[PDB]
Amino acid sequence: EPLKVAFVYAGPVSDAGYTYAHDQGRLAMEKNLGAKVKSSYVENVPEGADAERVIRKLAADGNKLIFTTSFGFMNPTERVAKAFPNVVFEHATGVKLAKNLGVYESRQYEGTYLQGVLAAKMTKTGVIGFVGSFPVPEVIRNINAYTLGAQSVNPKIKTKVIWVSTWYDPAKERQAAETLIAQGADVLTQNTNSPATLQVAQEKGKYAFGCDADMSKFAPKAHLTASISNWGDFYTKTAQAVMAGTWKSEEVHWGMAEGMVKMAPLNAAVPPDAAKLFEEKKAAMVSGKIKPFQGPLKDQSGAVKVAAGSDLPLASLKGMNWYVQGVEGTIPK
Ligand SMILES: CCNc1nc(O)nc(NC(C)C)n1
Numbered sequence: 118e119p120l121k122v123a124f125v126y127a128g129p130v131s132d133a134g135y136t137y138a139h140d141q142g143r144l145a146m147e148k149n150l151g152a153k154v155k156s157s158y159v160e161n162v163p164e165g166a167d168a169e170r171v172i173r174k175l176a177a178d179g180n181k182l183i184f185t186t187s188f189g190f191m192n193p194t195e196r197v198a199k200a201f202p203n204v205v206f207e208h209a210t211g212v213k214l215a216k217n218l219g220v221y222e223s224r225q226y227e228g229t230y231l232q233g234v235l236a237a238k239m240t241k242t243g244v245i246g247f248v249g250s251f252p253v254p255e256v257i258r259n260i261n262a263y264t265l266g267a268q269s270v271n272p273k274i275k276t277k278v279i280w281v282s283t284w285y286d287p288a289k290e291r292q293a294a295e296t297l298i299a300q301g302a303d304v305l306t307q308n309t310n311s312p313a314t315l316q317v318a319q320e321k322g323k324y325a326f327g328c329d330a331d332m333s334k335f336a337p338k339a340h341l342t343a344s345i346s347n348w349g350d351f352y353t354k355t356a357q358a359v360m361a362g363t364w365k366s367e368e369v370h371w372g373m374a375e376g377m378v379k380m381a382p383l384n385a386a387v388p389p390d391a392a393k394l395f396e397e398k399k400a401a402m403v404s405g406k407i408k409p410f411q412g413p414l415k416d417q418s419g420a421v422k423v424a425a426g427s428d429l430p431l432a433s434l435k436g437m438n439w440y441v442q443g444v445e446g447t448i449p450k
Contacts, residue, residue, distance in 0.1 A: 119152060119153060119154055119155040120150075120153060120154050120155070120181055120182060120356060120359055120360050121155050121157075121178075121179050121180045121181055121182075122143075122146070122154050122155070122156045122157075122180065122181070122182045122183075122184075122356055123156070123157050123158065123159075123175040123178075123180040123182070123183045123184070124139065124140070124143050124156065124157070124158040124159075124183075124184045124186060125158070125159055125162050125168065125171060125172060125175070125183065125184065125185045125186060125187075125190060126139060126140070126158060126159065126160045126161070126162060126186055126187070127161075127162055127163075127164055127168075127186065127187035127189060127190065127284060127285070128160065128161065128187075128284060128285040128310050129160045129161055129285075130158075130160055132285055132310045132311055133311070133312055133330060133332060133335070134285075134310040134311055134312065134327070134328050134329045134330050134332065135284070135285070135310035135328065135329040135346070136160065136186070136285070136310060137329070137330055138329040138330050138345070138346040138347075138348060139184075139186045139209075139346075139348055140158065141330075141348070141349065142346075142347070142348025142349045142351070142352045143156050143158060143348075143352060144349075145348075145349025145350075145352065145353065146349060146352040146353045146356055149349070149353040150353060150356055150357070150360075153356075153360060154356050154360075157175070157180070159171050159175070162190075164187060164188070164189025164190060165189055165192070165193070166193070168185070168189070168190050168193040169193035169196060169197060172185060172190070172193055172194060172197040173197050173200065173201075176197055176200070176201040176204045180204065181203075181204055181205065181359060182204070182205045182207070182355065182356060182359045183197075183204060183205070183206050183207070184207045184208075184209070184352070184355075185206065185207070185208045185209065186209045187209060187210070187284065188209070188210045188211065188251075188253055188255065190208060190209075190211075191208055191211040191212075191213055192213075194206050194208045194211070194213075194218065195208075195213045195215065195218060198215050198217050198218040199215070201217070202216070202217055203217075204217060205217055205219075205355075205359050205364055206218045206219070207219050207220070207221055207355060208220050208221075209221055209222060210222045210253075210255050212435060214366050214367075214368065215366060216366060217366070218366060219355075219364075219365075219366045219367050219368070219369065220368050220369070221351060221355075221368075221369040221370075221371075222255065222369070222370050223346055223370070223371060223372065223377045223378050224370055224371065224372030224373070224377070224378060225255075225259060225329075225344050225346065225378055226258040226259050226261075226262035226409050227262070227372045227373050227378055227402050227409060228344025228345075228373070228378045228379075228380060229258075229259045229262040229263045229266070229306065229344060229409075230262040230263070230265060230266035230398075230402065230409040231266060231342075231344075231380060231395060231398055231399055231402060232263060232266065232306050232326045232341070232342065232344065233245070233262065233263040233264060233265065233266020233267040233268075233269075233274075234266045234267070234269060234270055234394060234395060234398050235304075235341050235342065235383075235387065235391060235395050236263065236266070236267050236274075236304035236306070236324070236326075236341075237266070237267040237268070237269070237270030237271045237274055238270060238387070238388075238390075238391035238394065238395075239304050239324050239341060239386075239387070239391065240267075240271075240274070240303055240304050241303055242301045242302070242303045243271065243273060243274060243275065244274075244275045244276075244277055244300075244301045244302045244303065245263065245264075245267055245274060245275070245276050245277075245302060245303075245304045245305070245306075246276070246277050246278075246279070246294075246297035246298070246302025246303075246304070246305040246306070247259075247260050247263060247276055247277070247278045247279070247297075247305070247306055247307065247308075248279060248281065248290055248293045248294060248297070248305065248306070248307035248308070248309050248314050249278050249279065249280045249281070249307075249308055249309075250280070250281060250282070250283060250284045250308050250309050251280070251282060251284075252280070252438070254434075254435060254436060254437045254438065255308065256308040257437045257438060257439070257440070258409075258410075258434065258437050259306070259308050260276065260278055260308075260440065260444060261409075261410070261437065261440060261441045261444070262409040262410075263276060263306055264276040264440075264441050264443050264444055265409055265410075265414075265441060266398075266409070268441075268443060269398075270394070274443060275443055275445060276443055276444050276445070277297055277300055277301070277302050277445055277446070277447055278444060278445070278446055278447070279293045279296055279297055279446070279447040281293050281309060283309070284308075284309055284310050285309060285310040285311060286309070286311075287311040287312075287313040288313075289309075290307065290309045290311050290313035290314055291313040291314075291316070291317055293309075293314070294313060294314040294317035294318065294325075295317055295321075296447055296450050297447065298317065298318070298321050298323055300447050300448060302323075303323045303324065304323065304324045304325065304341070305317075305318055305323065305324070305325040305326070306325065306326045306328070307325075307326075307328050308328070309328070310328070310329070312327070312332040312335035312336065315327065315332050315335050315336035315339050315340055316335055316336055316339075318336060318339035319335075319336035319337075319338050319339035323339060324339055324341050324384075324386075325339050325340065325341070326340070326341055326342060326343055326344065327340055327342070327343025327344070327345075327381060328343065328344060329343075329344070329345065329346040330343065330345060330346070331343050331345060331381040333381065333384075337384075338384075338386070340381075340384055341383065341384045341386075341387065342380050342381045342382065342383055342384065342395075343380070343381035344378060344379075344380065345378070345379040345380065345381055346377065346378065347376055347377050347378070347379060348377070350375075350376060350377070351369065351371060351377060373399075373402050373403045374403055374404075374405065380399060383395065408428050408429075410423065410428060410429035410434060411423070411427075411428050411429075412424045412425050412426060412427045412428065412429075413425040414429065414441060415441070415442055416439045416440060416441065416442070417439070417440045417441065417442055417444060419442070422439065
């Protein structure tokens with residue numbers, strides 16, 4: 118019989134960003150494994166308590182492998198996994214494991230560091246902007262990596278952050294982008310899921326980056342590049358392991374070296390000196406010659422976090438709740 122695989126999304130496949138990319142991973146798994154797998158998905162599932170009913174129903178319907186693709190499914194996934202010990206659960210970006218519960222994530226911050234390098238080359242104000250969802254480790258690593266990448270070019274760069282308290286709401290994302298631009302940011306990145314920030318950047322004559330997918334068709338003048346998320350090989354490997362009986366609970370983190378994180382082509386507006394530097398830093402990121410959180414690092418209180426010649430430990434990366442010097446908030450509107 119085919120292995121029944123289900124995907125739980127916190128957003129819509131029509132976001133053209135994060136959920137789109139997870140769903141392209143599901144479709145890659147279907148193409149790679151053919152008749153050996155039967156996939157289904159549910160979109161726009163609310164995070165926290167109400168997700169538990171959806172996850173339980175997919176397990177009750179006979180799914181043997183369930184991917185919960187958002188941070189806020191962590192505790193519902195852990196509870197359903199205890200109730201379904203013969204089902205394999207994989208939770209994106211979480212830190213809770215069990216005999217039948219693994220966690221997976223990308224090192225997207227490797228891409229965000231490269232975006233910061235390019236932002237420092239393209240900014241006219243010296244202020245880069247970040248549209249944030251919630252202050253969880255995934256997002257704080259991306260804010261810090263954007264800032265460190267920019268500071269590798271111009272140590273005087275400032276990063277302004279605005280929080281929308283949602284992963285996906287194109288109206289709120291549009292308003293947040295307008296506010297960052299009004300407060301002097303002219304190269305924007307995000308950890309929300311829509312092309313709204315890009316559309317605002319194009320309207321105002323500013324720059325921004327795609328997130329999880331190439332978003333250039335939404336804003337071809339503003340789109341400098343994008344950090345593309347490729348989940349298809351991970352979803353394939355995981356479904357293969359369950360079918361073959363090799364699956365075990367583990368924490369998986371893949372980056373540019375493993376092909377989970379890739380960069381879109383550069384916009385034609387990027388000048389040759391910036392393009393050359395970007396390609397050198399990209400090669401170094403893939404080879405591990407540079408790491409985004411290599412020392413020396415200080416936090417925003419001036420405390421040393423990592424000495425020169427050391428790297429930030431995996432446990433500090435996993436729990437990151439501190440900001441590098443140069444990160445600030447927006448004035449509340
Ligand atoms: C709709 C839920 N979206 C979501 N959830 C988690 O956990 N992380 C991300 N990250 C993107 C790169 C911003 N997005």
